[PDB]
DNA sequence: ATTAGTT
DNA sequence: TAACTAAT
DNA sequence: ATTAGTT
DNA sequence: TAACTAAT
């Protein structure tokens, strides 16, 4: 299937992602900004156990690393009864320099969809932000304290990739992905590609230009280091669900 | 003094007032209006005793009279620990046809005060509304229930003069007083007269044109049936207190 | 005694 | 979304 | 655990 | 002038 011909393009078969052509991002602070260090809130054993596995996997993939930073924000337990780690980065958001909100809202994104393109492929990239590297100078910004009493493990960890919870993560990825798919857009003039952060839509007039496009797009995302979710892929269809909207023939 | 030469013009010496040249007023209702009859609220003996004297005086002067009406509004006790009668006429106000608010606000009234008139006389009429008669067809509107258990006196009373609490009483009096002092305004072109309901101000350039005006005005108010309060009169002065404002030379 | 109107 | 101030 | 924001 | 809902 589509899964056999493109092993590299799917998170199921391709491994962890990594945008190899994108330089590590530098995060500029405001002109008056100084490091803020919030002490970790005491966490229950239940949450600490629920979260510990996610931390260890991240350390193993190298997405998380030991560090020592004058910045520190609190880790939160958030529950379905599974505990995800959720860094509260608002005090870091407050101190980072604003960037233009270049990402269009869904509505406007769809307006630029001609009606002659009724064959749809919808992909969503898996763990998009973690594919973008973080420059070592900007990594200390996102440090949190990891403290596993029942193991003697206390110390700070921070991120090597674009983190969850950072106000600029969605815009910076959308821009990064636009850079990487600019050449694809030029090699396929008759195709339409909509990008909403980690949510893509390819549109053609024939189910064949679509097949030939989805192949090309999957080929390209895999070679650039991105991974689509095959579980949610909607390939060469006449109606698809994109950004809440259901697109059938042209309606909506 | 001014009190000896004008006995008729002062409430102190002139008796109860009565605008003899003004026909009894008819009060038109709205087009959809029907009589409303609110039952008297049970009143304590303390209030009933505090209010009883005021009622009896009013019956004696003929300002209050027995009647039988499909209209009825509640009497209230209001306290200084003296109990005044206060008819709640809002449900009657709601059903009476609106009239233009021709009375100007103090501020605008004063704007038309030239600076060459720095000699002031300020009068305020006593019980102004009660000087205006009420047409017998409009009297039932303002009926209240008077019930003195410890005397066997129960039954309805209503007003023969413009009542307190009626939304149109101030405008209708101001208009009535303007009609009555129109000729005075013509016989004294060099005088300035401001009227705010029951609050008058005469203004001249000399303390003599003022004396000769105050005499003429007192003469006129007395013959028309109005009564000024001598206790509060401010006669031929260079500074006076009118409608909150203090008028001295021309300032304010 | 009711009620229009207000952070 | 909690009670007053004034008004008649 | 905090907090921005809401009749 | 009384507590929430979601957000990180």
C-alpha pair distances (Å), B251 with each of A189, B116, B244, B245:
81, 12, 13, 10
Residue B252 belongs to some domain of the structure: no
Using the CA of A73, which nucleotide's C1' is the nearest one? F8
Q: How far is the CA of B190 from the C1' of E7 (A)?
A: 60
Residue B11 belongs to some domain of the structure: yes
Q: How far is the CA of A237 from the C1' of F6 (A)?
A: 36
Does residue B91 reach within 7 angstroms of strand D, measured from its CB? no
Q: Phi and psi of A120, rounded to 5°?
A: -120, 140
Residue B34 belongs to some domain of the structure: yes
Using the CA of B89, which nucleotide's C1' is the nearest one? D8
Nucleotides of D under 7 A from a protein CB: 8
Residues A14 and A35 in one domain: no
User: Over the Cα atoms of chain A, what is R_g?
Assistant: 20
Is residue A191 within 8 Å of residue A202, measured between CB atoms?
yes
| Contacting residues 71-90/B vs strand C (CB within 7 A) | 74, 76, 78, 88, 90
B198: helix, strand or coil: coil
Distance CA A166, CA A92 (A): 8
Report the nearest residue to nucleotide C2, CA vs C1'.
Answer: B88
Residues B90 and B12 in one domain: no
Distance CA A239, CA A221 (A): 23
Rounded to 10 degrees, what is the CA torsion of B128, B131, B137, B143? Answer: 60
Does residue B86 reach within 7 angstroms of strand D, measured from its CB? yes
Residue A19 belongs to some domain of the structure: yes
CB < 7 A contacts with chain F (nucleic strand): A 76, 78, 86-90, 93, 165
Residues A121 and A179 in one domain: yes
Using the CA of A166, which nucleotide's C1' is the nearest one? F8
Distance CA B233, CA B237 (A): 11
Does residue A84 reach within 7 angstroms of strand E, measured from its CB? no
B235: helix, strand or coil: strand
Residue A252 belongs to some domain of the structure: no
Contacts of A133 (CB under 8 A, 6+ apart): A18, A19, A22, A23, A24, A25, A160, A161, A162
For the record, the structure tokens of B207 come out as 């303390």
Is residue A134 within 8 Å of residue A237, measured between CB atoms?
no
Residues B198 and B166 in one domain: yes
CA B221-B223-B225 angle, 5° bins:
70
Does residue B207 reach within 7 angstroms of strand C, measured from its CB? no
The DSSP code sequence of A178-210 is HHHTHHHHHH-TT-EEEEETTEEEEEESSHHHH
Nucleotides of E under 7 A from a protein CB: 1-4
Q: Which residue has the tokens 């609110």?
A: B38
Nucleotides of C under 7 A from a protein CB: 1-4
| Contacting residues 51-80/A vs strand E (CB within 7 A) | 74, 76, 78
The strand pair at B234-237 and B199-204 is best described as: unpaired
Using the CA of B41, which nucleotide's C1' is the nearest one? C1
Q: What are residue B120's DSSP bridge partners? A: B203, B237
Distance CA A144, CA A156 (A): 6
Sign of CA dihedral A66, A69, A71, A73: positive
Residue B244 neighbours by CB distance under 10 Å: 7
Residues A64 and A104 in one domain: no
Report the nearest residue to nucleotide E4, CA vs C1'.
Answer: A90
| Sheet arrangement for strand B119-124 | B192-196, B199-204, B119-124, B234-237
**Resolution (in Å) of the shown entry?**
2.6
Residues A69 and A144 in one domain: yes
- Number of domains within chain B: 2
For the record, the structure tokens of A132 come out as 């973008």
Buried b (16+ CB within 10 A) or exposed e, B126-162: bbbbbbbbbeeebbbbbbbbbeeeeeeeeebbbbbbb
Contacts of B247 (CB under 8 A, 6+ apart): B110, B113, B120, B201, B239, B240, B241
For the record, the structure tokens of A174 come out as 């959308």
| Residue ranges with strand state E in A35-143 | 64-67, 75-78, 84-87, 119-124
Residues A121 and A55 in one domain: no
Residue B80 belongs to some domain of the structure: yes
Q: How far does chain A reach from its first CA to its final CA, in angstroms?
A: 30
Does residue A41 reach within 7 angstroms of strand E, measured from its CB? yes
Burial-class residue A59 by CB neighbours within 10 Å (0-12, 13-18, 19+): middle
Contacts of A78 (CB under 8 A, 6+ apart): A84, A85, A86
Distance CA B180, CA B198 (A): 13
Does residue A170 reach within 7 angstroms of strand E, measured from its CB? no
Residues B126 and B200 in one domain: yes
Q: How far is the CA of B238 from the C1' of D5 (A)?
A: 39
For the record, the structure tokens of A19 come out as 């945008």
Is residue A236 within 8 Å of residue A215, measured between CB atoms?
no
Contacts of A44 (CB under 8 A, 6+ apart): A77
Distance CA B251, CA A204 (A): 83
Q: How far is the CA of B110 from the C1' of C6 (A)?
A: 31
Residues B110 and B188 in one domain: yes
Nucleotides of F under 7 A from a protein CB: 8
Residue A170 belongs to some domain of the structure: yes
Domain region containing B229: 2-27+99-132+162-247
Q: Where are the alpha helices (DSSP H) in chain A?
A: 2-5, 11-14, 45-60, 90-93, 106-111, 169-180, 182-187, 207-224
Residue A237 belongs to some domain of the structure: yes
Biggest alpha carbon distance in chain A?
Answer: 63
Residues B124 and B201 in one domain: yes
Distance CA B79, CA A128 (A): 76
Q: Which of A42, A69, A67, A17 is nearest to A229 (CA)?
A: A17
Distance CA B223, CA A214 (A): 105
Does residue B36 reach within 7 angstroms of strand C, measured from its CB? no
The strand pair at A119-124 and A199-204 is best described as: antiparallel
Residues B90 and B103 in one domain: no
Expt. technique: X-ray
Q: Which of A211, A199, A192 is nearest to A116 (CA)?
A: A192
Report the nearest residue to nucleotide E1, CA vs C1'.
Answer: A41
Residues B45 and B115 in one domain: no
Does residue B165 reach within 7 angstroms of strand C, measured from its CB? no
Distance of CA B119 to the CA centre of its chain: 26
């Amino acid at each position: 299937t589509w899964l056999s011909d493109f092993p590299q393009a799917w998170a199921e078969t391709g491994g962890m992602g990594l945008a190899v052509r994108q330089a590590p991002l530098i995060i500029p602070l405001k002109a008056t900004s100084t490091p803020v260090s919030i002490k970790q809130y005491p966490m229950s054993q239940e949450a600490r156990l629920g979260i510990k596995p996610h931390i260890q996997r991240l350390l193993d993939q190298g997405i998380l690393v030991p560090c020592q930073s004058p910045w520190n924000t609190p880790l939160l337990p958030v529950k379905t009864n599974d505990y995800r780690p959720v860094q509260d980065l608002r005090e870091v958001n407050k101190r980072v320099e604003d960037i233009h909100p270049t990402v269009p809202n869904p509505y406007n994104l769809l307006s630029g969809l001609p009606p002659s393109h009724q064959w749809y492929t919808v992909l969503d990239l898996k763990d998009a932000f973690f594919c973008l590297r973080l420059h070592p100078t900007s990594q200390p910004l996102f440090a949190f304290e990891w403290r596993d009493p029942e193991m003697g493990i206390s110390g700070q960890l921070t991120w090597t990739r674009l983190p969850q919870g950072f106000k600029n993560s969605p815009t910076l990825f959308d821009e990064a992905l636009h850079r990487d798919l600019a050449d694809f857009r030029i090699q396929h003039p008759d195709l339409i590609l909509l990008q909403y952060v980690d949510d893509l839509l390819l549109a053609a007039t024939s189910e064949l230009d679509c097949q030939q496009g989805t192949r090309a797009l999957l080929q390209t995302l895999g070679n650039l280091g991105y991974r689509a979710s095959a579980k949610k892929a909607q390939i060469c269809q006449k109606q698809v669900k994109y950004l809440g909207y259901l697109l059938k023939e042209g309606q909506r």
